[PDB]
């Protein structure tokens, strides 16, 4: 019967309404309830035929299902919108978000739930606001749609409409007597969303409706966000609000210059110099009652500059690009603070620009400052540590020395972030457990890249001791990936993913240096994964025994010398010699096998399947366990 359901779903999705009616013709009531109620999966999309018919705009199919077959409008399922799939969307929601006005009218006129709540609390009105269809918004609100219904994160239709470029939708919402002071979960009161994308007309409309200015959660005014996003025109409009005072004007102009100093889309150093000059002149306008800048002490990351407390020194750095970049970064740090989310991005961008200009030391200083600031705020830095590994790899591939204190600092930060990643993974059950586990594995890979790069750099005894202390700290928490891989195993395994960028040149796995360092730092060499393979079991499965034979020989010597059993068995009860799959590895391991009577006895007991429980020492019960 499910084949008929698939036929019905395909006919409804493909627009063949006549074939759909022919298939649904002369059927019983239970048959048509099952056919129209079946939720088939065309991949990851769980949807009834009515939902997909409303999604793709088949208004004839919707009309046939509603007027004649009396199908319900409250069917729910998962839909593929913007590439990703989220549950909780009705057919009315799909018709609203896909711009199908005729299907919206057909569903509403037949009694669809206009105020249906998604699992993310997304109303079809919010869907039409996101799509920007003003006519659909008018029809929905005129059919008793509640504007005040926000999402899970308290993002109303007004907030997203302000964020989006559809000024007609937000202007209609505010003309319909909406809430001007709509607080969000993050504290953005519907003015930051408009003054983040540079929509001057939407900000004008809200100021006409007197949306009022209030500090958000991050300690920023909407003017502050407008200055951060380099959008100068909304900064001007917010300065012309007639209730701003002077100090806000100086700090807003300075922040605008700082944002223009380092950004991807907006990068014009002449704008930075002119805006900072205007800020300094406005600051030193009264002559008396001079508003001297309070300056944070100089930070080694941005060189050693101490801002520009005078217009003369600001003039002196007019022609120097990097001095102006450092000045913009410093004033941005002073204004937005060290705890702001957006303060880190220009630092990383300036570091990347320095890296492209083959200036690595200042790049490392800037990125270390950015990593410290982001770790103080306790956010995801796996991409950042990957960037550190990539730039270290490019330095090594270019035969440029890497500073040992920087390696120690980034390694300690990676260890700490792996610890909080473990805490997050333990805390998060199933909300974003896939993303959390992917971050965990990525962090482990980045740490191994950093260790491999540290092996290729000569370091002082103190710095080498600190690096080894950090590696020791990471081992004594025993990180594990999805398939039980201990941190030793990933350095052992050839299947460890390597980033496609310059990290292929330097960090190639397996790497004997990494294994020697990890065993010297106290790695548990007898640790086994979920599948039961030890480090030795993985290393004998290496498929390139001769191209890097020195690497294989050194790692097998290190593994045997650490104390790994050359006789233990995985979950499938296979000797590493039996899993050698290579004559070279078999010869090497037989050369390094140190046979003992205990090993032979335990192997014979396991092969004979004698009941060993409660007849042997408990410590030897483990020995029977792996032998």
């Amino acid at each position: 019967m499910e084949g008929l359901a698939g036929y019905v779903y395909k006919a409804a999705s493909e627009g063949k309404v006549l074939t759909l009616a022919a298939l649904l013709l002369n059927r019983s009531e239970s048959d048509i309830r099952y056919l129209l109620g079946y939720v088939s999966q065309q991949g990851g999309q769980r949807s009834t035929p009515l939902i997909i018919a409303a999604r793709n705009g088949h208004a004839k199919v919707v009309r046939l299902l509603l007027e004649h077959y009396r199908v319900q409008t409250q069917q729910t399922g998962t839909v593929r919108f913007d590439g990703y799939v989220i549950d909780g969307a009705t057919a009315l929601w799909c018709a609203a978000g896909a711009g199908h006005f005729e299907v919206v009218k057909l569903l509403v006129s037949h009694g669809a739930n206009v105020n249906h709540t998604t699992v993310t609390n997304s109303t079809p009105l919010r869907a039409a606001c996101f799509d920007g269809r003003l006519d659909i918004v008018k029809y929905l609100v005129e059919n008793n749609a509640n504007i005040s219904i926000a999402n899970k994160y308290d993002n109303t239709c007004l907030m997203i409409a302000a964020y989006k470029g559809h000024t007609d939708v937000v202007r209609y919402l505010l003309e319909q007597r909406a809430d001007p002071n709509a607080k969000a979960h993050c504290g953005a009161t519907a003015l930051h969303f408009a003054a983040e994308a540079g929509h001057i007309d939407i900000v004008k409309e809200l100021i006409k409706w007197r949306a009022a200015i209030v500090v958000n959660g991050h300690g920023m005014t909407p003017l502050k966000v407008a200055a951060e996003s380099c959008k100068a025109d909304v900064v001007e409009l917010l300065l012309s609000h007639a209730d701003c005072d002077r100090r806000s004007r100086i700090e807003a102009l300075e922040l605008l210059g700082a944002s223009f100093a380092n950004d991807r889309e907006n990068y014009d150093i002449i704008k930075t110099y002119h805006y900072l000059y205007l800020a300094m002149l406005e600051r030193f306008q009264d002559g008396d009652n001079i508003l001297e800048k309070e300056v944070l002490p100089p930070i080694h990351a941005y060189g050693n500059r101490t801002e520009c407390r005078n217009p003369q020194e600001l003039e002196s750095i007019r022609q120097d690009r990097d001095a102006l970049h450092m000045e913009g970064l410093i004033v941005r740090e002073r204004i937005l603070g060290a705890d702001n989310i957006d303060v880190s991005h220009p630092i990383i961008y300036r570091g990347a620009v320095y890296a492209d200009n083959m200036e690595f030391e200042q790049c490392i200083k800037l990125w270390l400052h950015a990593l410290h600031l982001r770790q103080k705020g306790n956010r995801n830095t796996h991409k950042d540590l990957l960037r550190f590994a990539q730039v270290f790899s490019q330095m090594i591939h270019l035969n440029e020395t890497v500073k040992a204190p920087d390696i120690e600092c980034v390694l300690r930060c990676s260890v700490l972030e792996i610890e909080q990643s473990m805490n997050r993974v333990k805390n998060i059950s199933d909300a974003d457990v896939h993303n959390a586990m992917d971050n965990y594995e990525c962090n482990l890979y980045t740490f191994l890249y950093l260790v491999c790069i540290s092996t290729k750099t000569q370091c002082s005894e103190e710095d080498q001791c600190k690096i080894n202390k950090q590696i020791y700290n990471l081992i004594h928490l025993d990180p594990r990936t999805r398939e039980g891989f201990t941190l030793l195993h990933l350095a052992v395994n050839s299947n460890t993913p390597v980033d496609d960028f310059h990290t292929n040149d330097v960090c190639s796995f397996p790497n004997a240096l990494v294994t020697k360092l990890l065993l010297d730092c106290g790695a548990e060499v007898n640790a086994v994964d979920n599948e039961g393979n030890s480090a030795l079991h993985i290393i004998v499965q290496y498929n390139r025994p001769i191209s890097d034979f020195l690497t294989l020989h050194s790692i097998i010597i290190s593994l045997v010398e650490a104390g790994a059993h050359t006789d233990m068995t995985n979950k499938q009860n296979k000797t590493p010699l039996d899993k050698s799959t290579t004559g070279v590895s078999e010869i090497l391991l037989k050369t390094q096998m140190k046979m003992s009577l205990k090993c032979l006895a335990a192997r014979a007991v396991r092969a004979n399947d004698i009941n060993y429980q409660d007849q042997i020492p408990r410590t030897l019960e483990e020995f029977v366990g792996f032998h």
Binding site: I86, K152, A184, C186, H192, I341, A352, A355, D356, V391
Partner: peptide, 21 residues
């Protein structure tokens, strides 16, 4: 690829911007 950080959108993805927010 290079070194260019794709975090300018991440600084703007902290606001609830999505199909639902």
């Amino acid at each position: 690829y290079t070194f260019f950080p794709p975090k300018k959108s991440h600084g703007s993805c902290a606001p609830p911007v999505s199909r639902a927010g």
